[PDB]
Structure formats: C-alpha cells, structure tokens
Amino acid sequence: LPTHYGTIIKTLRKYMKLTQSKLSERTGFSQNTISNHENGNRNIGVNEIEIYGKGLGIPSYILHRISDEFKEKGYSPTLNDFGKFDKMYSYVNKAYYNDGDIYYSSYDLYDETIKLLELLKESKINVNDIDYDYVLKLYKQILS
Amino acid sequence: ELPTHYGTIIKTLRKYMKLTQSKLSERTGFSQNTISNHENGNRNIGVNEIEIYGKGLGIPSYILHRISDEFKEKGYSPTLNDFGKFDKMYSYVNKAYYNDGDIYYSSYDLYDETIKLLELLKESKINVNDIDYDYVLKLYKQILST
Amino acid sequence: AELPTHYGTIIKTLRKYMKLTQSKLSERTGFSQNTISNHENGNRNIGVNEIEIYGKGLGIPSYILHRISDEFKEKGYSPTLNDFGKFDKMYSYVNKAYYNDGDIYYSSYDLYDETIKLLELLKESKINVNDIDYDYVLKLYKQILSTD
Amino acid sequence: GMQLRFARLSEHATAPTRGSARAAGYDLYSAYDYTIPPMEKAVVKTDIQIALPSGCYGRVAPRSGLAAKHFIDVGAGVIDEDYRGNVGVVLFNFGKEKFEVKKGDRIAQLICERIFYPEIEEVQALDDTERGSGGFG
Amino acid sequence: YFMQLRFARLSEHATAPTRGSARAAGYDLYSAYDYTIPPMEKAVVKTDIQIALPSGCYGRVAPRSGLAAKHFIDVGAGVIDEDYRGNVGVVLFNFGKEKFEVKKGDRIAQLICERIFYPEIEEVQALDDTERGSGGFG
Amino acid sequence: QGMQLRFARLSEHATAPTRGSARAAGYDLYSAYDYTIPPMEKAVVKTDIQIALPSGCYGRVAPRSGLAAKHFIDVGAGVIDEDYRGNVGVVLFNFGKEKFEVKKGDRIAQLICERIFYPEIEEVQALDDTERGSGGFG
C-alpha cells in the first residue's frame, strides 16, 4: 500500500542540496505544500512525482523505482546509497545513448544500474574510481 | 453505370434527421435550390458532395456509400428501410469499438457488424429499442470470436 | 575513403554542361568566384557539405555527384560524366517512372544504377535516348528489374 | 494540409473511407482477389492514386483485427508525397493457414504521418549530448 | 498546462507509463499479465491502462530495439486512435526459435505520439504526374 | 537556414545518407559491412554513421518497398531517439525462403524524421468515453 514518496522527496531534495524555498520556486508548489508532501500530510501520486522529478533534476521514473524498493523490501538500498546510484546511472545513461551494443541490447537502465553497482560491490571496486571504458565492458558483459 | 440513388438516400435521411431543406442548406452551404435538384433527381452527386451531406446530416459519409451499394448490388437497402433501428445498433457498435479492447482488436467493419447484429436480432424477434448496450456487447463479442 | 573524390573536375564539367559561368553559379551557391575557381582547380577540399550546395546551384540532385565520384574510385574514369547529356535524359524517364508507375516503385533498387543499365541497353541496341518513347523505356525498365 | 486527393485507376477501386473525423487512417480496399499462403506475402493493388497533403508521407499501416486474429502484417508502407502510381499494400501472412483477400476487402489504413525534410550536413564528430551525459541536476 | 498524455489504470496490475529522458520518442508500456509466446506465434499483451492521446497525434505502439535485436520480437498492429478508451493492447509477434516469456511488469513496447494530419478526402477524375517526377536537370 | 540532419562517419566503410528528391520521406541508409541473413533469420546491419536528429522528431528506420515486395525483407526495431549518438543499426528480418545477401554499400533501409509530441503524462481515476465514441447520429 504505502509509497514512501514523502521520504523519497525529502531525502532527494537534501541529496541535491535544495532548500524547500528553491524546490518551491522550481516546482510551482508553495513551501507549505512541499512540507506537507514531505511529512505525509498530503497524498503524492504520478502527477506530483512528475513535478518533483523536474524540480529535483532526477527523472520521475527513478522515484517510481525507489518507491518500488520500499514496497518490495521495507526500505530502499538505492535511496540509502543515492550517491553511488547517481554516479553509476550517469555512466549507464551515457553508454545507452552513445554505444550501439548497449542501445540495441539494453532492457532497463535502472535495473542495469543496480546490477552494475552489485557487481562493483562484490568485486570491491569503488564507483567513483572505475574507468568509464571499463564500466562499458562490465555493462556489455551483464547484457550478453 | 448503375445509378447511386443518392438523391433518394439523402432525402430519406434528411427527413429521418428531422431537418428542413433550409436547415441542411444552412449547415452545408448548398442553396435550398441545389439541394432540391439533388433530391428531385437529374442534378448529380459525387463522393465530394456526399462528404458535405454526411457532415450536414450528422451521419458518417461512408454509411451513405454503403447504402448506395446495397441498391447497386441488391436493388434495395435493408439499412435505409429500418434506418432508425440501424442508428440505435450503430451507436452501440461504435461505443463498443472505441471503449472495449476485445472489439477494437477484433472488428473487421463496424457497418457489416451492425447489419449482422440487427439480422441476428430480427431472427430472434428481439426489438433493438427493447434491449441495452450490455446485451449487444455479449452478442458482438460472440460473432467476432472464431 | 582513401581514394580521391575528383569533385573539382565533376563540378567544372557539370557547371559547363549547364551553360553557367563561375559568376552565375557564385550568385546561386553563395561561394565566391575565388572559392569556386579553387574548388574546380582541386586546391580547396570538397566534402558532402559543398556538394549539397553545388547540387542546388546546378539543378542536379547532390547524390548523383557522389555516384559520379564513385565511378572514378571504381573505374578510374566516369562514363556518366563523359556522356552526361544522355544520363540526364534517361534519368528524367527513370525518375518519372519511379514516381508514376507502381511496378517500378514496388521493385526499383536504385534509380542511378537503373539509369546506367538502361543507357547500356540502348547503346547495345543502337537506340537514341533523345528519340525513345517513355512508354517503351518503361517496358525496358520493367525488363531490367525482372532479372531479380 | 486539409486535402487528401485520390483518383480511381479502374472500376475495381473503392473510395478510401474513415468512420470518425479523428481516425488515424483512411481504410484502403483491395481491387482484386488474392490467396496468400501461410508464411508468404503479396502485393495487393487498391487501383487508387493519391496526392498526400504537403509536409507528410503516406504510411500504409496494419489493421489491428487482421493483426490480432489472422497474424496479418504490412511490410513496406512508405508512400512518398510525389508518388502518383497505384497504391500497393504489401501484406505478410505469418499465420499457419492461407489468408483470402476478395475485391472490396479492407486490408490496411493510410495515415498522413507528419515529417521533416531536413538538409544533410557532415561533421567530423558529434558531441555526446547534455542529456546523453552528466549526473542528476 | 494543456496538451498531455492522460491515462487511467483499469486494474491494480497496471504500471504508469515511464520515460527515462525528456526527449525519448516513446513512453514505456508494461505487461499487466503473464504470457508464454511459443515460436512463430503472437499474443495480445494487455497493459490494463486506458489513454487519452493529445490532439494532432495518434498513438503508435512501437518495438523495443533490444527485444527485436536479441529475441526477434516484433509489434503488429500498433495504431491507437485519439478516441480509443479501451485497454491498450500490444500485439507481440515471436519470430524467434525459442518461446518468449512475458511477466507482469515487463517492458514489452513503447508508445509514440506520432503527429498526423486528419485530412478531408476529395475524389478527382485523374491526378497529374508531379513536376519533380521528370523534367531534366536544371 | 534549413533544418539539418547532422551525421559523422564512424569508419571509412560508411556511406553518407542520400535522398533522390527534396520531398522523399527518407534518407537512404547503407550497410558498412557484408552480412548473410539465412531464411527466417535477423541481423543487426551497421551503417557506421552517427546522427543528430533535428528537434521535434525521432528517426524511424523504415523498410524499402522493393526489398519488401521482391525479397520479403522487413525492418524490426527502427526507433532512433533524438539523443542517440551511437552507430545507427538496421535490424533486418529475412522472412523469405532464400538467404538474403548484404554487401558493404547496399541500400538496406531509409531514415524518416517522424514529427512527434513529447507529452507530459497525467494519471486520472477514469477516462470518460468520447463524444465521437458514444451516442447516435446528430
């Protein structure tokens, strides 16, 4: 039942170092609205997540997938490590739009980001050190 | 070669839609004269005038064409005979097609399917006005299944 | 592409064929008489972007200049450029046929290659491209495409 | 572009039809009978020529019913705005059994797909885009 | 501020269409159900969503690149009219040698808002051949 | 000035896309390599070009009419997003009884600049049936 969108918005607003005032200027929601959204005093669905996504600078569907984790696990690993996710996703996103082997093989960028982070973790590799060109080779490997 | 019977079709449907030669002349931009020469006979009627009469009458142009072809093919139009029963049945079929996936992903032709349902209902002594959308929908799904 | 393009010769030969001066082509392309002279002489480099503009300036589809360049890379000379009058006439028929005949539209592989195959057939048969009826070309064209 | 002009090339043609003012395509009708065996194709003639409105091409597109019920599909489909020949529909029968077309059968739709006619430009290399790069924000 | 792509769930099995990037051609469509598609067979895969496309477009249900290139999956039909308000169905063709499994929540196609003209049909006795068709160069 | 389709060559093997006429729906795409497509098989055919589509369209990789009618060749996938800067591939399906040969320099498909919307998405509880989708004549 529960979405946890309130927590997701608060956490991502903080992750992107935005004041409620700034997110308000950008989204068109007042600070009172954003506070009630964040605190669970006002329901959040698809239509609010479209606005928040644009305001945060994070594709709306990622908030859907983070919400999906909470429901499927009790918490979101990705939200807990959003810094690692933002970094890997920037590489996955780039590979998808600039490499034919990815564009003609990829099934889902968010699931592939998660698969790659799990692979870096198991290999004891740090996502902020890895070479793009090496990420690309790991990516082609998980798709094949 | 064979005549279209468009004058008679237009007249019969104009009267059915309860519009005057003047109201149709309003909506179409054909002179109350031109309209009469078209119904009275001799003045001819192209697919291009039938597009204008369709919009004028508030009936899909293509149904005039399919009525005209009942005449060319069979010398009579069961649709133009009981047009009020055809309007009712068409409205249910049109609704089904645009609002139900089973029909949208199965229909071949909305007109032929209206006919085939009226014919199944005439041969059940069931009156169209005496049944409802959900009744028509069950039957429609049955005849589209193979 | 390693092999040179020979675009300088192609533009000079086609501009002359169209009975244009450096100056008139200059007015149409936007290239100065200096630039055009330097293209034709083979001094300045000529790529797809210049050929798009030269195409519009000459009233010749740009891709034909590409095709003519390919004749040099493959043969060391261009039969098309050597007898362009004939190519222009036969291409006008092939083009009209592609856009107006459903048998051609639903079978054609390449208008350029088919213009060449048709000109080869007329030379064999000693028929003049300037004299042949369109309705006869069309029968020749369907025959050439019948092979495949 | 408000006008789709057409002309009959034979007595066998049917005028294209559109039930609704906002249907995506005009219905196209076969002008002849054809028997398409399983796993074969055919070129179905309409015996109509068209003049598309300016700024579109004509896409010959599948009927949903023929696709979902009979495993019928449309290959080809691109009609250039300058094409004045006979409009042909390339039908693909991927079904287990033969597919019968009779004269006057509705076999496809014609959509006026709006498109650009862009000029071509070579560059030495294209930059990875601002959306095809960068982290969030 | 419209216009938009409106949709509604017909069941709890639906997934809200998703688009990874502001300029992706298509919205992602998700299966609401399990399906097994044997080799050289087809299936109508339900989304359990209904959509109201914006004005001046139809909805094209278009193939996924990876699904085609790796599993020989294709999309039949795919025309969705402005007035269609039924369950959005995807007609999947499996031209592969192996059966293709669809699970609830699998991405099986994309929805493209294809911009179109809705023109008026006009019969004419004969069209002329266009100038562009022939003439000579120059 | 005029809308530009920008491309760059990813190898010496690529051919610059071509258009016979100012109003052709598609630019011609060329194979950069030799392929042999067995009966009822597919192959990803590389052009070794990258493209920058103009704003407001996606690139549709669309079948050639001749190849369809004479050799039962079709195009799978075929959606190129505005942001795609990778090698443009053509997913060719050979549905023919005979194998289909691709040589380097062969025309295997056309690229159409399909105008689309990029709509915002809005969930509602239920879509009402349309006017044109309800009631009788009048």
Author numbering:
A (entry chain EEE): 10 to 153
B (entry chain CCC): 9 to 154
C (entry chain FFF): 8 to 155
D (entry chain AAA): 0 to 136
E (entry chain BBB): -3 to -2, 1 to 136
F (entry chain DDD): -1 to 136
What's in the article?
Stl, the master repressor of the Staphylococcus aureus pathogenicity islands (SaPIs), targets phage-encoded proteins to derepress and synchronize the SaPI and the helper phage life cycles. Our previous work has shown that the Stl repressor, an all-alpha helix protein, is a modular protein composed of an N-terminal domain with the characteristic helix-turn-helix (HTH) folding, which mediates DNA binding, followed by a middle and a C-terminal dimerization domain. Trimeric Duts show high sequence conservation at the residues that make up their active centers, which has been used to define five catalytic motifs (motifs I to V) that are the signature of this family of enzymes. For all these Dut-StlN-ter complexes, the Dut maintains its trimeric state and binds three independent Stl monomers, each of which uses predominantly its middle domain to interact with individual active centers of trimeric Dut.
The hDut-StlN-ter complex was crystallized in the space group P212121, and its asymmetric unit contains one trimer of hDut and three StlN-ter monomers, with a 1:1 assembly identical to both that which was observed in mDut-StlN-ter and that which was previously reported for the ϕ11Dut-StlN-ter complex. In the hDut-StlN-ter complex, the three Stl protomers are well defined with the exception of the 8 to 10 N-terminal residues for which, as in the case of the mDut-StlN-ter complex, no electron density is observable. Surprisingly, in the case of the hDut, the structure allows not only the trace of the main body of each Dut protomer but also the C-terminal motif V. This P-loop, unable to position over the active center occupied by the repressor, is projected toward the Stl and introduces its C-terminal end between the middle domain and the DBD of Stl. The Y116 side chain conformation in the hDut-StlN-ter is identical to that in the ϕ11Dut complex, although its placement is not restricted, because this Dut lacks motif VI. In the hDut-StlN-ter complex, all the Dut C-terminal tails are well ordered, showing a similar mechanism of Stl recognition and complex stabilization by introducing a conserved Phe from Dut motif V in the Stl interdomain hydrophobic pocket. However, C-terminal Dut tail binding is a consequence of the interaction of more than one residue, since the Stl repressor exploits residues from loop α4-α5 (G66, I67, and P68) and the helix α7 (Y98, S99, N102, K103, and N107) to interact with the main and side chains of different Dut motif V residues (D127, R130, G133, G134, and G136). On binding to Stl, the Dut C-terminal tail shows a totally different placement from that observed for nucleotide recognition.
